mmCIF file of C-alpha atoms and ligand atoms in Angstrom:
data_model
loop_
_atom_site.group_PDB
_atom_site.id
_atom_site.type_symbol
_atom_site.label_atom_id
_atom_site.label_comp_id
_atom_site.label_asym_id
_atom_site.label_seq_id
_atom_site.Cartn_x
_atom_site.Cartn_y
_atom_site.Cartn_z
ATOM 1 C CA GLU A 5 -20.664 39.609 12.950
ATOM 2 C CA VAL A 6 -17.951 37.153 12.005
ATOM 3 C CA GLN A 7 -15.268 37.868 9.346
ATOM 4 C CA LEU A 8 -11.591 37.237 8.525
ATOM 5 C CA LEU A 9 -9.659 40.441 8.220
ATOM 6 C CA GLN A 10 -6.117 40.132 6.669
ATOM 7 C CA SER A 11 -3.235 42.601 6.685
ATOM 8 C CA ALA A 12 0.057 42.185 4.697
ATOM 9 C CA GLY A 13 1.600 42.870 1.335
ATOM 10 C CA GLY A 14 4.864 44.038 -0.160
ATOM 11 C CA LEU A 15 7.523 43.208 -2.748
ATOM 12 C CA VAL A 16 10.525 41.438 -1.236
ATOM 13 C CA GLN A 17 13.747 40.115 -2.890
ATOM 14 C CA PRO A 18 14.638 36.504 -3.273
ATOM 15 C CA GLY A 19 16.887 36.575 -0.174
ATOM 16 C CA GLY A 20 14.263 38.320 2.016
ATOM 17 C CA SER A 21 11.305 37.211 3.946
ATOM 18 C CA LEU A 22 8.157 38.676 5.420
ATOM 19 C CA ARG A 23 5.225 37.859 7.702
ATOM 20 C CA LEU A 24 1.523 37.215 6.772
ATOM 21 C CA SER A 25 -0.970 37.985 9.539
ATOM 22 C CA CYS A 26 -4.762 37.035 9.696
ATOM 23 C CA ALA A 27 -7.178 38.055 12.424
ATOM 24 C CA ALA A 28 -10.493 36.329 13.171
ATOM 25 C CA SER A 29 -13.489 37.519 15.197
ATOM 26 C CA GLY A 30 -16.394 35.611 16.493
ATOM 27 C CA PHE A 31 -14.521 32.208 17.010
ATOM 28 C CA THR A 32 -11.413 31.370 18.802
ATOM 29 C CA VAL A 33 -8.625 30.441 16.442
ATOM 30 C CA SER A 34 -7.534 27.908 18.825
ATOM 31 C CA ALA A 35 -10.793 25.948 18.175
ATOM 32 C CA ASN A 36 -11.344 24.986 14.501
ATOM 33 C CA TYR A 37 -9.238 23.985 11.666
ATOM 34 C CA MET A 38 -7.226 26.757 9.813
ATOM 35 C CA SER A 39 -5.443 26.662 6.499
ATOM 36 C CA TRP A 40 -3.963 29.040 3.733
ATOM 37 C CA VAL A 41 -4.886 28.849 0.173
ATOM 38 C CA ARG A 42 -2.608 30.347 -2.479
ATOM 39 C CA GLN A 43 -3.972 31.494 -5.985
ATOM 40 C CA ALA A 44 -1.552 32.554 -8.579
ATOM 41 C CA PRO A 45 -2.575 34.663 -11.620
ATOM 42 C CA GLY A 46 -3.930 32.528 -14.403
ATOM 43 C CA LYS A 47 -3.915 29.463 -12.439
ATOM 44 C CA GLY A 48 -6.339 27.541 -10.024
ATOM 45 C CA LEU A 49 -6.089 27.531 -6.316
ATOM 46 C CA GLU A 50 -3.639 25.447 -4.422
ATOM 47 C CA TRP A 51 -3.254 24.407 -0.771
ATOM 48 C CA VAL A 52 -0.318 25.413 1.348
ATOM 49 C CA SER A 53 -0.999 24.462 5.003
ATOM 50 C CA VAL A 54 -3.413 23.132 7.660
ATOM 51 C CA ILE A 55 -3.222 23.712 11.341
ATOM 52 C CA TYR A 56 -5.321 21.423 13.596
ATOM 53 C CA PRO A 57 -6.417 22.337 17.142
ATOM 54 C CA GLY A 58 -3.750 20.704 19.247
ATOM 55 C CA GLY A 59 -0.831 22.132 17.257
ATOM 56 C CA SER A 60 -0.181 19.367 14.596
ATOM 57 C CA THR A 61 1.180 20.989 11.424
ATOM 58 C CA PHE A 62 0.851 19.962 7.834
ATOM 59 C CA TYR A 63 2.577 21.230 4.823
ATOM 60 C CA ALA A 64 2.397 20.889 0.956
ATOM 61 C CA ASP A 65 4.971 18.827 -0.609
ATOM 62 C CA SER A 66 5.988 21.630 -2.976
ATOM 63 C CA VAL A 67 6.512 23.781 0.143
ATOM 64 C CA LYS A 68 7.761 21.044 2.379
ATOM 65 C CA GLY A 69 9.720 22.870 4.956
ATOM 66 C CA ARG A 70 10.863 26.606 4.184
ATOM 67 C CA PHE A 71 7.474 27.868 5.675
ATOM 68 C CA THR A 72 5.888 27.942 9.121
ATOM 69 C CA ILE A 73 2.266 28.354 10.320
ATOM 70 C CA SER A 74 1.864 29.603 13.825
ATOM 71 C CA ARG A 75 -1.298 30.649 15.726
ATOM 72 C CA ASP A 76 -1.494 33.118 18.699
ATOM 73 C CA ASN A 77 -4.133 32.274 21.240
ATOM 74 C CA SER A 78 -3.568 35.472 23.158
ATOM 75 C CA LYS A 79 -4.333 37.694 20.135
ATOM 76 C CA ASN A 80 -6.822 35.559 18.511
ATOM 77 C CA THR A 81 -5.063 35.788 15.210
ATOM 78 C CA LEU A 82 -3.514 33.376 12.617
ATOM 79 C CA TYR A 83 0.172 33.932 11.600
ATOM 80 C CA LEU A 84 2.155 32.647 8.559
ATOM 81 C CA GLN A 85 5.829 33.279 8.257
ATOM 82 C CA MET A 86 7.652 32.788 4.827
ATOM 83 C CA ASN A 87 11.318 32.258 5.006
ATOM 84 C CA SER A 88 13.648 32.097 1.965
ATOM 85 C CA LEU A 89 11.106 33.116 -0.667
ATOM 86 C CA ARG A 90 12.141 31.777 -4.011
ATOM 87 C CA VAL A 91 11.725 33.144 -7.415
ATOM 88 C CA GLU A 92 8.388 32.844 -9.239
ATOM 89 C CA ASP A 93 6.510 32.530 -5.876
ATOM 90 C CA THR A 94 4.226 35.536 -6.131
ATOM 91 C CA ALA A 95 0.566 34.925 -5.514
ATOM 92 C CA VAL A 96 -2.374 35.982 -3.632
ATOM 93 C CA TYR A 97 -2.658 34.262 -0.292
ATOM 94 C CA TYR A 98 -6.005 33.594 1.377
ATOM 95 C CA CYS A 99 -7.036 33.047 5.109
ATOM 96 C CA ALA A 100 -9.667 30.500 5.383
ATOM 97 C CA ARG A 101 -11.021 28.202 8.103
ATOM 98 C CA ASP A 102 -12.108 24.542 7.369
ATOM 99 C CA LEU A 103 -14.719 22.078 8.447
ATOM 100 C CA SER A 104 -13.949 19.263 6.036
ATOM 101 C CA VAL A 105 -17.266 17.439 6.264
ATOM 102 C CA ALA A 106 -19.959 19.957 7.329
ATOM 103 C CA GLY A 107 -18.258 22.633 5.282
ATOM 104 C CA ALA A 108 -15.287 23.196 2.952
ATOM 105 C CA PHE A 109 -13.541 26.532 3.589
ATOM 106 C CA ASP A 110 -16.757 28.211 4.842
ATOM 107 C CA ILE A 111 -15.428 31.834 5.259
ATOM 108 C CA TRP A 112 -12.488 33.561 3.549
ATOM 109 C CA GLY A 113 -10.277 36.359 4.007
ATOM 110 C CA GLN A 114 -10.119 39.400 1.792
ATOM 111 C CA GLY A 115 -6.941 38.074 0.262
ATOM 112 C CA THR A 116 -3.476 39.733 -0.019
ATOM 113 C CA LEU A 117 -0.648 39.258 -2.449
ATOM 114 C CA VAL A 118 3.100 38.667 -1.888
ATOM 115 C CA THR A 119 5.359 39.695 -4.815
ATOM 116 C CA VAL A 120 9.056 38.664 -5.472
ATOM 117 C CA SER A 121 11.692 40.146 -7.682
ATOM 118 C CA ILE A 139 -6.088 13.026 -7.509
ATOM 119 C CA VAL A 140 -5.957 15.315 -10.556
ATOM 120 C CA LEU A 141 -9.228 16.792 -11.598
ATOM 121 C CA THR A 142 -10.309 17.975 -14.948
ATOM 122 C CA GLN A 143 -12.805 20.567 -16.149
ATOM 123 C CA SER A 144 -14.774 19.256 -19.219
ATOM 124 C CA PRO A 145 -17.147 22.121 -19.969
ATOM 125 C CA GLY A 146 -14.307 24.530 -20.729
ATOM 126 C CA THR A 147 -15.013 28.272 -21.420
ATOM 127 C CA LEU A 148 -18.718 27.598 -21.821
ATOM 128 C CA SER A 149 -20.664 30.784 -22.674
ATOM 129 C CA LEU A 150 -24.287 30.753 -22.550
ATOM 130 C CA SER A 151 -26.968 33.605 -23.073
ATOM 131 C CA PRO A 152 -28.872 34.791 -20.006
ATOM 132 C CA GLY A 153 -32.011 32.947 -19.325
ATOM 133 C CA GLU A 154 -31.112 29.393 -19.856
ATOM 134 C CA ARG A 155 -29.830 26.501 -17.818
ATOM 135 C CA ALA A 156 -26.128 25.499 -17.879
ATOM 136 C CA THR A 157 -24.613 22.165 -16.994
ATOM 137 C CA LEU A 158 -20.980 22.054 -15.523
ATOM 138 C CA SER A 159 -19.359 18.617 -15.423
ATOM 139 C CA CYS A 160 -16.406 17.808 -13.319
ATOM 140 C CA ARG A 161 -14.489 14.608 -13.613
ATOM 141 C CA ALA A 162 -12.136 13.087 -11.116
ATOM 142 C CA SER A 163 -9.652 10.204 -11.180
ATOM 143 C CA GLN A 164 -9.959 7.903 -8.132
ATOM 144 C CA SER A 165 -13.719 8.128 -7.958
ATOM 145 C CA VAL A 166 -14.102 9.316 -4.443
ATOM 146 C CA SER A 167 -17.201 9.089 -2.264
ATOM 147 C CA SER A 168 -20.142 11.238 -2.981
ATOM 148 C CA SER A 169 -19.907 13.359 0.162
ATOM 149 C CA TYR A 170 -16.697 15.045 -0.632
ATOM 150 C CA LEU A 171 -16.612 17.481 -3.578
ATOM 151 C CA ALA A 172 -17.626 21.140 -3.153
ATOM 152 C CA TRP A 173 -18.352 23.981 -5.573
ATOM 153 C CA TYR A 174 -17.166 27.573 -5.567
ATOM 154 C CA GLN A 175 -17.987 30.813 -7.176
ATOM 155 C CA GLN A 176 -15.311 33.444 -7.480
ATOM 156 C CA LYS A 177 -16.044 36.963 -8.999
ATOM 157 C CA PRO A 178 -13.208 38.657 -10.572
ATOM 158 C CA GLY A 179 -10.693 39.704 -7.845
ATOM 159 C CA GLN A 180 -12.761 38.676 -4.744
ATOM 160 C CA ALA A 181 -12.646 35.883 -2.221
ATOM 161 C CA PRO A 182 -14.267 32.695 -3.420
ATOM 162 C CA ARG A 183 -17.432 31.501 -1.858
ATOM 163 C CA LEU A 184 -18.931 27.900 -1.507
ATOM 164 C CA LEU A 185 -22.196 26.764 -3.029
ATOM 165 C CA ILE A 186 -22.508 23.260 -2.040
ATOM 166 C CA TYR A 187 -20.237 21.284 0.385
ATOM 167 C CA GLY A 188 -21.660 17.772 0.285
ATOM 168 C CA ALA A 189 -22.384 17.672 -3.448
ATOM 169 C CA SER A 190 -26.074 17.740 -2.594
ATOM 170 C CA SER A 191 -26.517 20.326 0.280
ATOM 171 C CA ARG A 192 -26.504 24.084 -0.486
ATOM 172 C CA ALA A 193 -24.665 26.343 1.793
ATOM 173 C CA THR A 194 -26.407 28.813 4.127
ATOM 174 C CA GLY A 195 -27.274 32.090 2.559
ATOM 175 C CA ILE A 196 -27.451 30.554 -0.934
ATOM 176 C CA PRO A 197 -30.352 31.266 -3.509
ATOM 177 C CA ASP A 198 -32.351 28.292 -4.582
ATOM 178 C CA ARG A 199 -31.329 28.532 -8.181
ATOM 179 C CA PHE A 200 -28.135 26.512 -7.462
ATOM 180 C CA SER A 201 -28.210 22.649 -7.545
ATOM 181 C CA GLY A 202 -25.605 20.168 -7.806
ATOM 182 C CA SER A 203 -25.527 16.290 -8.108
ATOM 183 C CA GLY A 204 -23.758 13.224 -9.545
ATOM 184 C CA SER A 205 -22.057 10.458 -7.603
ATOM 185 C CA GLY A 206 -19.082 8.181 -8.308
ATOM 186 C CA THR A 207 -16.712 9.526 -10.911
ATOM 187 C CA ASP A 208 -18.649 12.534 -12.192
ATOM 188 C CA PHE A 209 -20.249 15.542 -10.606
ATOM 189 C CA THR A 210 -22.696 17.943 -12.234
ATOM 190 C CA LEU A 211 -23.886 21.398 -10.999
ATOM 191 C CA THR A 212 -26.344 23.573 -12.701
ATOM 192 C CA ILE A 213 -27.967 26.916 -12.328
ATOM 193 C CA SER A 214 -31.710 27.466 -12.150
ATOM 194 C CA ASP A 220 -23.665 36.207 -12.251
ATOM 195 C CA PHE A 221 -20.462 35.481 -14.280
ATOM 196 C CA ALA A 222 -17.337 33.956 -12.622
ATOM 197 C CA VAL A 223 -14.964 31.119 -12.616
ATOM 198 C CA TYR A 224 -16.273 27.922 -10.947
ATOM 199 C CA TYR A 225 -13.881 25.519 -9.314
ATOM 200 C CA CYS A 226 -14.014 21.892 -8.085
ATOM 201 C CA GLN A 227 -12.794 21.214 -4.615
ATOM 202 C CA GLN A 228 -12.134 17.851 -3.101
ATOM 203 C CA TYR A 229 -10.801 16.818 0.489
ATOM 204 C CA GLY A 230 -10.112 13.280 1.581
ATOM 205 C CA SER A 231 -6.345 13.172 0.541
ATOM 206 C CA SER A 232 -3.330 14.685 2.111
ATOM 207 C CA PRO A 233 -2.619 17.268 -0.604
ATOM 208 C CA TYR A 234 -6.157 18.387 -1.644
ATOM 209 C CA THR A 235 -6.832 19.577 -5.152
ATOM 210 C CA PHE A 236 -8.770 22.244 -7.112
ATOM 211 C CA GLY A 237 -9.986 22.067 -10.641
ATOM 212 C CA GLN A 238 -8.754 24.420 -13.244
ATOM 213 C CA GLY A 239 -12.095 26.016 -13.624
ATOM 214 C CA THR A 240 -14.332 27.283 -16.300
ATOM 215 C CA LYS A 241 -15.339 30.691 -17.605
ATOM 216 C CA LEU A 242 -19.087 31.314 -17.608
ATOM 217 C CA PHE B 323 -6.568 -16.309 21.589
ATOM 218 C CA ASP B 324 -8.023 -17.030 18.049
ATOM 219 C CA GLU B 325 -11.631 -16.118 19.223
ATOM 220 C CA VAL B 326 -10.364 -12.478 19.972
ATOM 221 C CA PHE B 327 -8.136 -11.998 16.850
ATOM 222 C CA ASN B 328 -10.842 -12.568 14.122
ATOM 223 C CA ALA B 329 -14.592 -12.658 14.468
ATOM 224 C CA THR B 330 -17.893 -11.430 12.875
ATOM 225 C CA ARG B 331 -17.749 -7.760 13.598
ATOM 226 C CA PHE B 332 -15.446 -4.868 14.763
ATOM 227 C CA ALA B 333 -15.819 -1.739 16.925
ATOM 228 C CA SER B 334 -15.697 1.637 15.566
ATOM 229 C CA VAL B 335 -12.565 3.922 15.965
ATOM 230 C CA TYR B 336 -13.794 6.277 18.751
ATOM 231 C CA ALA B 337 -14.921 3.228 20.913
ATOM 232 C CA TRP B 338 -12.196 0.775 20.252
ATOM 233 C CA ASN B 339 -12.531 -2.703 22.003
ATOM 234 C CA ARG B 340 -9.824 -2.881 24.539
ATOM 235 C CA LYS B 341 -10.036 -6.633 24.549
ATOM 236 C CA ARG B 342 -8.346 -8.420 27.318
ATOM 237 C CA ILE B 343 -6.145 -11.563 27.274
ATOM 238 C CA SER B 344 -6.260 -13.682 30.532
ATOM 239 C CA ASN B 355 4.116 -20.743 8.227
ATOM 240 C CA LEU B 356 3.164 -16.979 8.824
ATOM 241 C CA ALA B 357 -0.485 -15.916 9.415
ATOM 242 C CA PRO B 358 -2.322 -15.248 6.216
ATOM 243 C CA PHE B 359 -2.461 -11.416 6.864
ATOM 244 C CA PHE B 360 -0.300 -9.502 4.350
ATOM 245 C CA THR B 361 0.830 -6.580 6.509
ATOM 246 C CA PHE B 362 2.774 -7.088 9.723
ATOM 247 C CA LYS B 363 5.225 -4.884 11.531
ATOM 248 C CA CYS B 364 6.635 -4.953 15.057
ATOM 249 C CA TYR B 365 8.138 -1.913 16.897
ATOM 250 C CA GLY B 366 9.809 -3.959 19.662
ATOM 251 C CA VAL B 367 11.004 -7.530 19.590
ATOM 252 C CA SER B 368 9.989 -9.705 16.693
ATOM 253 C CA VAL B 380 -1.434 -8.113 27.870
ATOM 254 C CA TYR B 381 -4.010 -6.076 25.870
ATOM 255 C CA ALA B 382 -5.082 -6.625 22.239
ATOM 256 C CA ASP B 383 -7.199 -3.808 20.749
ATOM 257 C CA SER B 384 -9.183 -3.946 17.590
ATOM 258 C CA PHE B 385 -11.148 -1.459 15.254
ATOM 259 C CA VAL B 386 -11.600 -0.566 11.605
ATOM 260 C CA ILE B 387 -9.864 2.409 9.933
ATOM 261 C CA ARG B 388 -9.463 3.351 6.353
ATOM 262 C CA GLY B 389 -6.561 1.916 4.236
ATOM 263 C CA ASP B 390 -4.486 4.801 3.789
ATOM 264 C CA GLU B 391 -4.618 5.983 7.543
ATOM 265 C CA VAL B 392 -3.127 2.783 8.992
ATOM 266 C CA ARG B 393 0.153 4.549 9.030
ATOM 267 C CA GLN B 394 -0.844 7.008 11.852
ATOM 268 C CA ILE B 395 -1.189 3.879 14.239
ATOM 269 C CA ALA B 396 2.595 3.962 14.162
ATOM 270 C CA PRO B 397 4.292 4.659 17.490
ATOM 271 C CA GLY B 398 4.311 8.456 17.815
ATOM 272 C CA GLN B 399 2.852 10.209 14.785
ATOM 273 C CA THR B 400 0.483 13.122 14.402
ATOM 274 C CA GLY B 401 -2.610 13.232 11.957
ATOM 275 C CA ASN B 402 -6.356 12.831 12.333
ATOM 276 C CA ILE B 403 -6.869 9.518 14.041
ATOM 277 C CA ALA B 404 -3.418 9.103 15.743
ATOM 278 C CA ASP B 405 -3.983 12.047 17.950
ATOM 279 C CA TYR B 406 -7.717 12.619 18.097
ATOM 280 C CA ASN B 407 -9.035 8.987 18.338
ATOM 281 C CA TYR B 408 -6.475 6.423 19.159
ATOM 282 C CA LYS B 409 -2.913 7.243 20.248
ATOM 283 C CA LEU B 410 -0.044 5.014 21.006
ATOM 284 C CA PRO B 411 2.473 5.783 23.622
ATOM 285 C CA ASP B 412 5.946 6.770 23.113
ATOM 286 C CA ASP B 413 8.716 4.126 23.309
ATOM 287 C CA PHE B 414 5.915 1.684 22.336
ATOM 288 C CA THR B 415 6.263 -2.000 23.599
ATOM 289 C CA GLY B 416 3.952 -3.798 21.256
ATOM 290 C CA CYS B 417 3.349 -4.923 17.638
ATOM 291 C CA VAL B 418 0.791 -3.864 15.161
ATOM 292 C CA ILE B 419 -1.062 -6.007 12.587
ATOM 293 C CA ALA B 420 -3.431 -5.188 9.644
ATOM 294 C CA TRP B 421 -4.956 -6.730 6.552
ATOM 295 C CA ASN B 422 -7.354 -5.600 3.907
ATOM 296 C CA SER B 423 -10.899 -6.271 4.606
ATOM 297 C CA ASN B 424 -12.819 -4.868 1.648
ATOM 298 C CA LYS B 425 -14.836 -8.146 0.883
ATOM 299 C CA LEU B 426 -16.507 -8.576 4.439
ATOM 300 C CA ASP B 427 -17.126 -4.974 5.391
ATOM 301 C CA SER B 428 -17.955 -3.073 2.240
ATOM 302 C CA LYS B 429 -21.174 -3.796 0.230
ATOM 303 C CA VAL B 430 -22.805 -2.500 -2.833
ATOM 304 C CA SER B 431 -25.607 -1.068 -0.749
ATOM 305 C CA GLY B 432 -23.217 0.734 1.541
ATOM 306 C CA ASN B 433 -22.726 0.701 5.167
ATOM 307 C CA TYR B 434 -22.492 3.589 7.550
ATOM 308 C CA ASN B 435 -22.107 2.125 11.077
ATOM 309 C CA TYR B 436 -18.445 3.200 11.576
ATOM 310 C CA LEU B 437 -17.693 6.568 13.138
ATOM 311 C CA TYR B 438 -14.659 8.570 13.946
ATOM 312 C CA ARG B 439 -14.379 11.674 16.116
ATOM 313 C CA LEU B 440 -13.573 14.877 14.073
ATOM 314 C CA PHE B 441 -13.722 17.950 16.336
ATOM 315 C CA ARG B 442 -11.910 17.633 19.640
ATOM 316 C CA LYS B 443 -10.544 20.329 21.850
ATOM 317 C CA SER B 444 -7.124 18.699 22.467
ATOM 318 C CA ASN B 445 -4.978 15.625 21.807
ATOM 319 C CA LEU B 446 -5.345 12.330 23.483
ATOM 320 C CA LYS B 447 -3.048 10.857 26.164
ATOM 321 C CA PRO B 448 -1.569 7.631 25.265
ATOM 322 C CA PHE B 449 -3.960 4.758 25.450
ATOM 323 C CA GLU B 450 -6.806 7.045 26.311
ATOM 324 C CA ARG B 451 -10.362 6.544 24.918
ATOM 325 C CA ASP B 452 -13.463 8.662 25.238
ATOM 326 C CA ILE B 453 -17.107 8.020 24.478
ATOM 327 C CA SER B 454 -19.290 11.010 24.379
ATOM 328 C CA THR B 455 -21.654 13.064 22.219
ATOM 329 C CA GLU B 456 -21.370 16.736 23.092
ATOM 330 C CA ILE B 457 -21.478 19.578 20.609
ATOM 331 C CA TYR B 458 -18.237 21.244 19.675
ATOM 332 C CA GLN B 459 -18.283 25.036 20.324
ATOM 333 C CA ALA B 460 -16.196 26.455 17.448
ATOM 334 C CA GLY B 461 -16.732 29.901 18.620
ATOM 335 C CA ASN B 462 -18.175 31.683 21.726
ATOM 336 C CA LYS B 463 -21.860 30.750 22.005
ATOM 337 C CA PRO B 464 -23.478 28.330 24.604
ATOM 338 C CA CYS B 465 -25.989 26.985 21.859
ATOM 339 C CA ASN B 466 -28.113 25.486 24.679
ATOM 340 C CA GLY B 467 -26.847 22.149 23.691
ATOM 341 C CA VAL B 468 -28.547 22.321 20.167
ATOM 342 C CA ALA B 469 -26.471 22.241 17.026
ATOM 343 C CA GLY B 470 -26.241 25.554 15.267
ATOM 344 C CA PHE B 471 -23.926 27.750 13.123
ATOM 345 C CA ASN B 472 -20.954 27.610 15.435
ATOM 346 C CA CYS B 473 -21.928 24.270 17.105
ATOM 347 C CA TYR B 474 -21.146 21.028 15.262
ATOM 348 C CA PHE B 475 -21.612 17.234 15.966
ATOM 349 C CA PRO B 476 -18.239 15.779 16.600
ATOM 350 C CA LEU B 477 -18.790 12.353 15.214
ATOM 351 C CA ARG B 478 -18.980 11.847 11.421
ATOM 352 C CA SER B 479 -19.227 8.547 9.691
ATOM 353 C CA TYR B 480 -17.357 6.575 7.045
ATOM 354 C CA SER B 481 -18.861 5.663 3.557
ATOM 355 C CA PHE B 482 -17.885 2.298 1.978
ATOM 356 C CA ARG B 483 -18.517 0.888 -1.536
ATOM 357 C CA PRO B 484 -16.580 -1.979 -3.231
ATOM 358 C CA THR B 485 -15.649 0.041 -6.356
ATOM 359 C CA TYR B 486 -13.326 2.605 -4.651
ATOM 360 C CA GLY B 487 -9.630 2.958 -5.027
ATOM 361 C CA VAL B 488 -7.134 1.233 -2.945
ATOM 362 C CA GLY B 489 -6.641 3.157 0.291
ATOM 363 C CA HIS B 490 -10.266 4.148 0.747
ATOM 364 C CA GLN B 491 -11.181 0.487 1.546
ATOM 365 C CA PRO B 492 -11.606 -0.383 5.308
ATOM 366 C CA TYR B 493 -8.753 -2.082 6.968
ATOM 367 C CA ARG B 494 -9.000 -4.207 10.130
ATOM 368 C CA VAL B 495 -6.429 -3.427 12.669
ATOM 369 C CA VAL B 496 -5.539 -5.457 15.788
ATOM 370 C CA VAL B 497 -2.663 -3.905 17.885
ATOM 371 C CA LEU B 498 -0.911 -5.941 20.507
ATOM 372 C CA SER B 499 0.277 -4.173 23.582
ATOM 373 C CA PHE B 500 2.613 -6.288 25.748
HETATM 374 C C1 LIG C 601 -10.617 -16.848 12.419
HETATM 375 O O1 LIG C 601 -9.213 -17.533 12.966
HETATM 376 C C2 LIG C 601 -8.210 -17.868 12.177
HETATM 377 C C3 LIG C 601 -7.536 -16.638 11.613
HETATM 378 O O2 LIG C 601 -6.865 -15.947 12.695
HETATM 379 C C4 LIG C 601 -8.726 -18.816 10.977
HETATM 380 O O3 LIG C 601 -8.061 -19.977 11.117
HETATM 381 C C5 LIG C 601 -10.221 -18.886 10.941
HETATM 382 O O4 LIG C 601 -10.716 -19.450 9.903
HETATM 383 C C6 LIG C 601 -10.856 -17.501 11.089
HETATM 384 N N1 LIG C 601 -12.269 -17.528 10.832
HETATM 385 C C7 LIG C 601 -13.159 -18.216 11.503
HETATM 386 C C8 LIG C 601 -14.592 -18.094 11.142
HETATM 387 O O5 LIG C 601 -12.881 -18.783 12.479
#
């Protein structure tokens, strides 16, 4: 079996610092892409880091410097160390791999929180529909990126998100047939035939971006 | 010399033509990292031209085409939306995506072997933990600036 198991936590003061550790089984962490996704309460997901095989490191502009992502080949784990944690930096941090063409954050960690002392829009909004009928969810981007980029996610309350479609047309493995998504150009539409908040993902730019999401 | 600078087609990134040689030009972008031989040529996305600067990390600069340190050659580029991109869409441009390690300066590789993201032989057939390393671009005229293809011809003295 393959899974990401994560171990951290705590409540540290603005001066202090702590370490976030994520361990992987079934694939060498020194092989495929790795990243770190941060979710704050009441807000959509946000990207924090990417490590490529070979050691090149990339960081988000908002967290440019002041962090550090290091991987340990010997222990087959992934390490993130936060230094000089500011105020209002509390959020749940996710450990997730990356494929970026074949998949978009295929497998996710259980998610742990740290506490301290191309813009997309979501047209449908808090759309509520009775069970037994089809629902249309429309996602509108800005730069009108290629059709093979956006991916859609499902996140039950307080769990690790999962991917439904990565290429905007190809469902992920272990996904029921009731999910379908289409659209090319400036709009992307996904429909069903399970209540959650559904997000829009897009790669292809240095910072990445997530949609604000909708309540089903 | 002119018969090598500009022609009717260009080679993809992972197999860059190492073409040999043995009142400004009407190309908008021009930068030299030495003084104001081998001339290479390929096509890369508009926003990713920056990585062909001498000594920078990224996706193409370290996995597909890598300049040496203390570089002794100039770099040229110019937007090529009109000739390359079409409304139908072309997909004959490839870049390597999964590679085990970096590339030594002025090193190139041509190969199609499945990347082993985990610990499984795969018998050479693509699977859950085995991926095809080369994935293609996608071009269409009505895209934002930066996604359009750029022709690059680096000069290495
Ligand atoms: C190719 O060479 C130069 C630009 O470097 C230009 O004079 C010429 O028109 C270009 N095109 C062709 C078809 O020769």
